[PDB]
Design an enzyme around this catalytic site. Structure first.
Site, PDB file in Angstrom:
ATOM      1  N   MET A   5       7.275   2.306   2.108  1.00 23.74           N
ATOM      2  CA  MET A   5       8.512   2.295   3.198  1.00 23.74           C
ATOM      3  C   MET A   5       9.606   1.201   2.671  1.00 23.74           C
ATOM      4  SD  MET A   5       6.711   3.540   6.631  1.00 23.74           S
ATOM      5  CE  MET A   5       8.472   3.440   7.347  1.00 23.74           C
ATOM      6  N   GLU A   6       9.512   0.420   1.370  1.00 26.52           N
ATOM      7  CA  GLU A   6      10.273  -0.668   1.048  1.00 26.52           C
ATOM      8  C   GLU A   6      10.883  -0.890  -0.243  1.00 26.52           C
ATOM      9  OE1 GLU A   6       6.898  -0.992   1.993  1.00 26.52           O
ATOM     10  OE2 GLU A   6       7.455  -1.581   4.041  1.00 26.52           O
ATOM     11  N   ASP A  22      -4.697   6.217   0.719  1.00 25.17           N
ATOM     12  CA  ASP A  22      -5.171   7.223   0.980  1.00 25.17           C
ATOM     13  C   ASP A  22      -4.309   8.398   0.282  1.00 25.17           C
ATOM     14  OD1 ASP A  22      -2.649   7.570   2.627  1.00 25.17           O
ATOM     15  OD2 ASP A  22      -3.648   7.916   4.354  1.00 25.17           O
ATOM     16  N   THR A  72       1.001  -1.191  -0.123  1.00 27.48           N
ATOM     17  CA  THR A  72      -0.065   0.102  -0.067  1.00 27.48           C
ATOM     18  C   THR A  72       0.923   1.188   0.068  1.00 27.48           C
ATOM     19  OG1 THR A  72      -0.080   0.382   2.322  1.00 27.48           O
ATOM     20  CG2 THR A  72      -1.948  -1.117   1.127  1.00 27.48           C
TER      21      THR A  72
HETATM   22  O1  NOS Z   1       1.073   7.155   3.670  1.00 25.26           O
HETATM   23  C1  NOS Z   1       1.937   6.199   4.073  1.00 25.26           C
HETATM   24  N1  NOS Z   1       3.301   6.727   4.346  1.00 25.26           N
HETATM   25  C2  NOS Z   1       4.079   5.650   4.543  1.00 25.26           C
HETATM   26  N2  NOS Z   1       4.067   4.460   4.344  1.00 25.26           N
HETATM   27  C3  NOS Z   1       2.698   4.067   3.688  1.00 25.26           C
HETATM   28  C4  NOS Z   1       1.774   5.032   3.606  1.00 25.26           C
HETATM   29  N3  NOS Z   1       0.651   4.283   3.275  1.00 25.26           N
HETATM   30  C5  NOS Z   1       0.863   2.899   3.032  1.00 25.26           C
HETATM   31  N4  NOS Z   1       2.125   2.588   3.393  1.00 25.26           N
HETATM   32  C6  NOS Z   1       2.794   1.451   3.530  1.00 25.26           C
HETATM   33  O2  NOS Z   1       2.089   0.863   4.718  1.00 25.26           O
HETATM   34  C7  NOS Z   1       3.183   0.646   5.716  1.00 25.26           C
HETATM   35  C8  NOS Z   1       3.253   1.984   6.803  1.00 25.26           C
HETATM   36  O3  NOS Z   1       1.902   1.993   7.412  1.00 25.26           O
HETATM   37  C9  NOS Z   1       4.587   0.457   4.850  1.00 25.26           C
HETATM   38  O4  NOS Z   1       4.815  -0.652   4.546  1.00 25.26           O
HETATM   39  C10 NOS Z   1       4.364   1.338   3.602  1.00 25.26           C
HETATM   40  O5  NOS Z   1       4.897   0.974   2.616  1.00 25.26           O
END
Ligand code: NOS
Ligand code: NOS
Ligand code: NOS
Ligand code: NOS
Ligand code: NOS
Ligand code: NOS
Lengths: 226, 226, 226, 226, 226, 226
Positions: free
Chosen positions: E179-180, E203, E89
């Site tokens: 984040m990956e 979102d 996500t």
């Molecule tokens: O708005 C965001 N900011 C940062 N990470 C997000 C966001 N939406 C989804 N992820 C993803 O969900 C995890 C963090 O909740 C992380 O694995 C990132 O890749």
């Protein structure tokens, strides 16, 4: 060499380095005798001729640290050049500096990464050859020019989104912005040869209309060469 | 000021800046007349006296960018000083430079972070005031000294675990290592005042025994001051 | 050594390190018996004497990372010193910290480049020797002092143009600003010896008047030494 | 909060923070009474129960600065947590440190960029809350454990291509490598709350087999909490 | 391996990599036949099963560069995995991107230091395997999804104090934050294997409610795998 | 504009960007009808003509990030250009890539500081417009060329003293070295316009002889334009 099609020996040991290859052509036609064009690769004109009994070359460099670095490396390492004087333009970043002033760069600041990569952790201050600097300064003084000796900014970006840091540099005495000197001075130092940048102020940050001054400047650069 | 207990007006507009406060004492006793000591805070001796009809001061700075920056800020901002000449020692980082040579620093490289913090993303090249530089160079030349004008390294670390980068800087023409010039030149530029560093080479990287040369150097620094 | 004229064996294995050499003199005269002065090079006074049956030294360091690094390297590598306690002053950067408080530095933040050059890519957190820290903390607690154990900023610049980052550090619990601890702690760790910094708060960022507190602090530093 | 499905008030003000959510489950089942599981979002188990009359929580964090930062931000800012003790494992990077030793981190080094982005130009040294540190140290000492108080490396990379810098950090006294402490300590400081990391050494860089020691460690962490 | 308890051969050469181990469980139960769970170390569930005649695995990674780097290193180096597709996500950082859009990352920006440490002085741009990217794009197009191919931000911090730089990245076309991806793409390139990230927008920055879209996305990731 | 003497409307919305202005001339003469030359400032030739019913321009950029950045800024901001395709050469940094291969850059790594200055603390990954990329890829595939889609290095230095990092980048899949793509892709993204780089491999790191391939490549670039 890769970017210069000259035969060995065709390039003189003293060379002027305008950024604009069309200015190299102008310099050769206006000041030199017994001229030949030794390069037209990428349109980056280079000429050799004779000025007051001495062979001297003039080579466009293009704009920016990466472009001038190509030509300067090749000139020094493939053609044995020993004295390199950039003859360029710059934009003033202080009110005290005036259009048509001649700036002789002692040193240069930069936003380039070229020296950070070579000297991790250090701030390398690229410096002019003092003997060439003094010769050019004395020649400009005797010619009756407004000559300023000081610091310049060698910029990678001509179009910057914020000018805050350029203004701040001006508050620390940096005179003008241009796009080559850091590379020329650093590479000349690396190889133990002699470099200088002599610049005409063309505007403020914040050809024909400078052609008399521009000629007078070429004259002092040629002199500091011969 | 915080680190200097002088009253307003007690410090002359021209000042010599040895790193060693005991050298400030030596300079005052040896060269100046009508001397008074205006500071002994932290033992960092400062004196004002008269040399050839002109009031001139001499102030120890201590060693390193942070120490000299304290004194230079206070001298400029609290005492109205206008011409600041560091008179120091340095260690040669090339074979061509010899012990007892006098080096006049055009500019300085550094491993300090002081300018990276002020100018994020940029390499600031701290430059000498050319007018002072020329005066000192001409005076040293007329005095018959071996004078070298060029680049130096302002180091934060005297004891470095690897000398690879210092050697590399020497290969790019950097003449010697010392511990103050970047700060002096940067702060003088910030405040629109005039600075120079004049250094005696005391050894190679790779007092009495230099006292005659050292005096001759003080003499040219005083002259470039008056 | 280069900056300390002591003979081998003249410096004790435990040493106090004020920044001000005149404070070294004060400490020796006030607290120690059987005192000799082993150094006056650059006016950077050092003494050895006896406190409660134990030989202990006291050595000015000057101000800033580069200055203290010179002395600490020489003390450890040329004189075999094993326990080094800086006894200094600092400026509070939080309202909760009060003038005359004693701060024992667990660790230090810095704007120096010294550790970035040693550990490229890493943030090195210089740490106190816990055993010395605990001894000093317990001694200060028993003496009835206001003792705070925490983080400090080791600054290269005393005079900073913007205080935004210093304020931000205060918001992250950094207690006070000083100019030596990063270097002391890093070098002690490098050489496997024991270091601590014990500081009196002299003002807020945003001698006689602290002499009773200052003595009480010297006392706990001496104790954590013996 | 985004990653924790607890209702307001379900999380205690004191919390243990293992990296492994299955260790959170183990801690809750083994040490706590009146237990409820308040979170299973992403399998990142969190529990609240009672230890010696006090409510206390235990929350897995996952591995690495980014993962723990999510949970710690949410715990502090959405759930009002005040005392946070990481209970983790680490890999020794010195021969003096032995498997099954307990390390209490005073501070942490890192290869993360998280603090460089927050404090451009500075090295931020993230520090433990001294009061919690002392409590845990005293409890471990009284329990008869081998407790080491010192510096650790918070690594972003578990699998590093060269270990040269890790070895160098070990030569500067850094005890062990782990993957969370910088973030915990920095965020706790940001928000004015109290943090500590208490680690069991699981191997050398160069569960059941440590379960007795691991329990004894949980016990001191719980105690430093209650 | 250290963090995966699978026997050799239990993990398929093609693997899906959700951040949430509970999503790995969902994917296995919903899409795969002949399923076995090969890992529950740290609750980081991994499964192998059969999809349209092909063995395929699914492995939670946890959140952040350090966490995914552990699993990806182990999968590639200990289990011989060849095709790795993150199914994740993200949060939109432009108005043009809409919730439930599927983003296929060509490349990723980052605030992590992981690549600066590997390639000092350089900006490494981690890139998708084009063949996998094209397969996934074509599959999503044929499935009738809103598919966007472009740039993403791989963030170390979920909770950032200022969003100025995130907004600026959005102005330069960066689509979303996650984040990956930097770590997956960099490590796959290091080892000569094939990676892709396929993300559902959950979102805007400035499960059941996306489950139909989320399934359709898993379907295209599985297809680009088989 | 400053470096382009064209009148408003003389430059088409789709433009090819060779580094060599003489290649711009070649492209115009060889492929275009109804041609006019709109620029000869600094010899940096630019032309507009008609290809298969569509107006299209071709503009030399010079070599290096700073040079191309000047032209691209002016083309976008002063002349309203919308689709920009660099048609260049590059040097292979892997054995798998062969001379005369066509590389379409997805993204670019760099040793330039240009993006570090714009996005402090971040690694910006400059990305191609996917729609243009797909068009060019499909056209090259249908033309029967060897087309590779992947990562390139945009270098500031052509002559590098050590090739260790270039080799390392090759080990991470970076295909070739060139000197413009980072700037083109970043500026196109900044301004919301569409860019691509299509490169012919001219040698390995470790005109007529590529003219047939070079033409075929120009053809696919023109097509991805019209
Ligand atoms: O708005 C965001 N900011 C940062 N990470 C997000 C966001 N939406 C989804 N992820 C993803 O969900 C995890 C963090 O909740 C992380 O694995 C990132 O890749
Ligand atoms: O104001 C200026 N900014 C940047 N470079 C300048 C300026 N004035 C002259 N030049 C010089 O002219 C070329 C760019 O047009 C570059 O070669 C630079 O050195
Ligand atoms: O070889 C040297 N390295 C560093 N500084 C030196 C050297 N020689 C002289 N100085 C100068 O003397 C003090 C340090 O001893 C510093 O003030 C420095 O400028
Ligand atoms: O407010 C302060 N800023 C910086 N250093 C300070 C401050 N207060 C005390 N010191 C200490 O005193 C010397 C500088 O005057 C330095 O040695 C520093 O550690
Ligand atoms: O040798 C080690 N290197 C890195 N992290 C370690 C080590 N030993 C224990 N941990 C800890 O366990 C997880 C990673 O397996 C991380 O949470 C880290 O803090
Ligand atoms: O091997 C190479 N290194 C760097 N640039 C190259 C190479 N091959 C082609 N170019 C391209 O040609 C010009 C430099 O000669 C630059 O425009 C660069 O993009």
């Amino acid at each position: 060499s890769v970017h210069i099609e000259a035969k060995q020996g065709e390039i003189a040991e003293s060379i002027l380095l305008p950024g604009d290859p069309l200015r190299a052509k102008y310099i050769a036609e206006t000041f030199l005798e017994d001229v030949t064009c030794y390069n037209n690769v990428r349109g980056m004109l280079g000429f050799t001729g004779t000025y007051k009994g001495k062979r001297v070359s003039v080579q466009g460099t293009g704009m920016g640290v990466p472009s001038i670095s190509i030509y300067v490396n090749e000139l020094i390492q493939s053609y044995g050049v020993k004295n390199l004087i950039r003859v360029g333009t710059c934009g003033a970043i202080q009110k005290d500096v005036k259009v048509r002033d001649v700036i002789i760069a002692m040193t240069a600041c930069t936003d380039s990464n070229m020296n950070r990569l070579t000297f991790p952790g250090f701030d390398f201050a690229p410096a002019a050859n003092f003997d060439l600097l003094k010769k050019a300064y004395d020649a400009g003084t005797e010619k009756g020019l407004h000559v300023r000796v000081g610091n310049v900014l060698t910029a990678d970006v001509f179009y910057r989104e914020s000018m805050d840091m350029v203004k701040k540099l001006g508050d620390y005495g940096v005179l003008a912005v241009e796009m080559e000197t850091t590379a020329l001075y650093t590479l000349a130092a690396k190889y133990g040869v002699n470099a200088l940048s002599v610049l005409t102020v063309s505007d403020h940050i914040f050809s024909e209309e400078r052609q008399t001054t521009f000629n007078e400047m070429i004259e002092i650069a040629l002199d500091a060469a011969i």
